[model samples]
Target chain A: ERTFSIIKPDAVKRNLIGEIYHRIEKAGLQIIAAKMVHLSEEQASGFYAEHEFEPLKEFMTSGPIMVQVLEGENAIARYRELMNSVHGSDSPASAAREIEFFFPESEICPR
Target chain B: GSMALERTFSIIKPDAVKRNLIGEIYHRIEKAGLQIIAAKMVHLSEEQASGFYAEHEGKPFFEPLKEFMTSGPIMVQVLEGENAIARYRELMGKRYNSVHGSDSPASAAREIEFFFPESEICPRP
Candidate 1:
């Protein structure tokens, strides 16, 4: 299974990417693709448009965020469990949509 | 050369990052007594990548190396420890591998500065 995940701006500002990545790797999920992008407020709004939360948009656009595609057995659930302060796709369908949103040309390996 | 406390530059190259070997590489460095005091992920543009490898300009490996570097995101960091320069190079294994380390003190300083101009590097003991 492959899942989508994000290291939010808060973690990036605090420089916790390495530490959080360590935990993900320890859990046996492979990070197949990752990048740091400073999202504009408009982009943030689109990504979280399904939810009607304004505060989330402000916080997400605060700084650069690390977007990633993680692959492993039960990757969706596993990532959700590991990331308390970050965002993980809640289901397989959500994963596919979110991955496409961030990595439009993503050549994700077969699950 | 004395094994005095020192710092070195290291980059977990795009190849390693793409393969998800970060924790494996980091574990080896920490286990060997080296300390990674500062680290960040960056996807460099071709221009920025070329600037970082300016020393290798006009060399055969220069263009290929820079292209590979800008192809994906990489993790760059400052490794501090006794004899950090040589120690990290040795720890990363033979040449042309997925990891890179400065060959000497001068190279280490310059490489670190290129990646971390503001010097977020932690103070050494």
Candidate 2:
């Protein structure tokens, strides 16, 4: 199935977009959709609209963040494993919403 | 199997340009089943930005918003297929803003003319 992700502002500003892409691509996850958005703090709030609180908002809207749609085996779980906690996600219950928030009309990618 | 069709206008903003993330982005879009019907890289002039953000004309961030958009090159594109607009918008996150959402029907008479007038939005004979 397909999952969504962002390289994040710090990650992008620090030049980690490609390195991170390699990890995702090397792991065999397919990238389906993407775009860079130079977010205003106001705009960033809307992106996080699904959430009630956002500790990362300031950092996230600091610069342009690269958002994407990814695909491959056991997608939701697999991606969480890939990031491995530095900027990783926690648990399964909210995994889909957080990632899928950027891709509202997405379908489950193939294994 | 056949799928319903939807179209959306998209922009691949500046951050991606410097990092060489373009292909990877397109790589995933296709993998996930969206098709890029037409694509171009443009620096939106003040007027161009105004046209797109007409609804937010006097909004506080308008100036910075325009600067950010024109700060670097942007990949302008049109994408198509089942609920393309919403999917692209969500996948785009806060970075992505919807210009129109399920705001039109599929028939060319009602939909295609609003944005894409080129044959690119249509099947090649």
Model 1 has a DockQ score of 0.11
Where model 2 places Cα greater than 4 Å from the true spot, the runs are: A1-111, B1-3, B93-116, B119-125
Docking class of 1: incorrect
Cα shift from native, residue A83, model 2 (Å): 38
Q: Estimate each model's TM-score.
A: 0.59, 0.46
**Best-matching candidate per TM-score:** 1
Q: Report the first chain's TM-score for all candidates.
A: 0.88, 0.72
Question: Which pairs of residues collide in model 1?
Answer: none
Where does model 1 exceed 4 Å of error?
Answer: A1-23, A26-76, A80-111, B1-3
lDDT of 2 at A16: 78
Per-residue accuracy of model 2 over A25-62 as CA lDDT, tens digit each: 88988877777877777777876777743434665767
